[PDB]
């Protein structure tokens, strides 16, 4: 099975500290605060806020074409993608707010611009079809930062950083 577009997926990652390993899912809520967060699993507690739709999928050339002009397809490594949040209808984006050399990651409704675009990359070839069960690296088209699993005081967080994180994107 290979990942396609217009799908409903869950972005998961593996967090290990003090030898305790767990699966975390990316999530958010439309109300008030905009930032995303992570839920522990085992299936996460809340799954409605945990689902994303692969609305679009373009080449970087194509994406930049449309932008410059204004001045169920499959996914391929290197392509930029757009992830809408089922609940809020807003879009997974990379913000310009920090937390300190890392940006915040949240929802926003404005789908124009590069901030809401994430290029997908392989764990270890560009142009190849993305197979379900593959691990993905996501890079922000706007900032060129990575969707990153971060650790704070007591909790795990997500941000756009200079270091990478592997994401188990899968449907359900």
Swiss-Prot record:
Tissue expression per record = Highly expressed in heart, lung, cerebellum and brain. Detected at lower levels in adrenal gland, stomach, thymus, esophagus and ovary.
Family that this chain belongs to: Belongs to the ryanodine receptor (TC 1.A.3.1) family. RYR2 subfamily.
Comment field on protein domains: The calcium release channel activity resides in the C-terminal region while the remaining part of the protein resides in the cytoplasm.
Output this protein's name: Ryanodine receptor 2
The primary gene name is: Ryr2
Which cell locations does it reside in? Answer: Sarcoplasmic reticulum membrane
MIR domain residues are 72-123, 127-172
On subunit structure and binding partners, the annotation says: Homotetramer. Can also form heterotetramers with RYR1 and RYR3. Interacts with CALM and S100A1; these interactions regulate channel activity. Identified in a complex composed of RYR2, FKBP1B, PKA catalytic subunit, PRKAR2A, AKAP6, and the protein phosphatases PP2A and PP1. Interacts directly with FKBP1B, PKA, PP1 and PP2A. Interacts with FKBP1A and FKBP1B; these interactions may stabilize the channel in its closed state and prevent Ca(2+) leaks. Interacts with SELENON. Identified in a complex, composed of FSD2, CMYA5 and RYR2.
Q: What organism, scientifically named, is this protein from?
A: Mus musculus
Tell me what PTMs the record reports for this protein: Channel activity is modulated by phosphorylation. Phosphorylation is increased in failing heart, leading to calcium leaks and increased cytoplasmic Ca(2+) levels.
What residues of the intact protein does this structure contain? Answer: 12 to 217 of 4966
Q: What is this protein for, i.e. what is its function? A: Cytosolic calcium-activated calcium channel that mediates the release of Ca(2+) from the sarcoplasmic reticulum into the cytosol and thereby plays a key role in triggering cardiac muscle contraction. Aberrant channel activation can lead to cardiac arrhythmia. In cardiac myocytes, calcium release is triggered by increased Ca(2+) cytosolic levels due to activation of the L-type calcium channel CACNA1C. The calcium channel activity is modulated by formation of heterotetramers with RYR3. Required for cellular calcium ion homeostasis. Required for embryonic heart development.
The annotated consequence of gene deletion is: Embryonically lethal. Embryos die at about 10 dpc, due to defects in heart tube development. Cardiac myotubes display enlarged rough endoplasmic reticulum and cytoplasmic vesicles that contain high levels of Ca(2+).
């Amino acid at each position: 099975q290979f990942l396609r577009t217009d799908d409903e997926v869950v972005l998961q990652c593996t967090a290990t500290i003090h030898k305790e390993q767990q699966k975390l899912c990316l999530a958010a809520e439309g109300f008030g605060n905009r930032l995303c967060f992570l839920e522990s699993t085992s299936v996460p507690p809340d799954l409605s806020i945990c689902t994303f739709v692969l609305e679009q999928s373009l080449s970087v050339r194509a994406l930049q074409e449309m932008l410059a002009n204004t001045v169920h397809r499959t996914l391929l490594y290197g392509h930029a993608i757009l992830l809408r949040h089922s609940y809020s209808g807003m879009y997974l984006c990379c913000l310009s707010t920090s937390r300190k050399l890392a940006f915040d990651v949240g929802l926003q409704e404005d789908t124009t611009g590069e901030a809401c675009w994430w290029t997908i990359h392989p764990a270890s070839s560009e142009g190849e079809k993305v197979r379900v069960g593959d691990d993905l690296i996501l890079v922000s088209v706007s900032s060129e930062r990575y969707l990153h699993l971060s650790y704070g005081n007591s909790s795990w967080h997500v941000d756009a950083a200079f270091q990478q994180t592997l994401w188990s994107v899968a449907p359900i």
